[PDB]
Design a protein around this ligand. Structure first.
Ligand SMILES: Nc1nc(=O)c2nc(CNc3ccc(C(=O)N[C@@H](CCC(=O)O)C(=O)O)cc3)cnc2[nH]1
Ligand SMILES: Nc1ncnc2c1ncn2[C@@H]1O[C@H](COP(=O)(O)OP(=O)(O)O)[C@@H](O)[C@H]1OP(=O)(O)O
Length: 159
């Protein structure tokens, strides 16, 4: 099964030109916990912003162009990406906007982090109808000395 994982502010904003104005180490501990030892699919843009291959994960990058990094796998379409994952119990899709949009319709589960922040952004997570998903897990956290804003982790299963 395919799952999507993303952090979103109000308005489904997931990214902007510059770094986001927040610091959420807890969210990043969650992301890692949920993606480790699984293959992750991402768009060329997300990859550049990450910078290096995520450790302990099979990295598959989607690009219309030839790959410029032999440490990861480059594919040219959605179908190839899926096949590059092989026979695994769960494929994690990490972004960005374009990529989430293409995989949404094919995903069975969403691992979302709702951040209580209002920011200007230019990339949104795709609109989803809640009634189509069952919240199987949900846990709110207040901001703290380490996390600049409050947030809530939620796991959704496609009904
Ligand atoms: N929940 C969630 N949070 C995010 O920040 C997010 N980011 C992406 C794409 N951008 C990124 C950027 C950096 C790292 C990153 O450095 N990850 C290290 C974290 C080390 C730590 O725990 O700080 C990792 O190994 O996963 C991951 C994804 C995709 N889904 C998301 N989903
Ligand atoms: N179906 C697809 N086939 C090939 N490349 C694709 C793709 N969907 C997305 N991409 C790539 O993934 C990049 C988009 O990355 P992203 O989804 O991380 O970015 P954004 O968050 O800005 O929408 C696309 O620009 C394209 O890479 P190239 O610009 O190198 O062509």
């Amino acid at each position: 099964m395919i799952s999507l994982i993303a952090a979103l502010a109000v308005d489904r904003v997931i990214g902007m030109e510059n770094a986001m104005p927040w610091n959420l180490p807890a969210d990043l501990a969650w992301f890692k916990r949920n993606t480790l030892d699984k293959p992750v699919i991402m768009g060329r843009h997300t990859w550049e912003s990450i910078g290096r291959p995520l450790p302990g994960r099979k990295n598959i990058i989607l690009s219309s162009q030839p790959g410029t990094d032999d440490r990861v796998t480059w594919v040219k379409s959605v179908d190839e990406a899926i096949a590059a994952c092989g026979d695994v119990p769960e494929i994690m899709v990490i972004g960005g906007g374009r990529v989430y949009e293409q995989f949404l319709p094919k995903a069975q589960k969403l691992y979302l982090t709702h951040i209580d922040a209002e920011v200007e952004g230019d990339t949104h997570f795709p609109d989803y109808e809640p009634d189509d998903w069952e919240s199987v897990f949900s846990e709110f956290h207040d901001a703290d000395a380490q996390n600049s804003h409050s947030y809530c982790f939620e796991i959704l299963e496609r009904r």
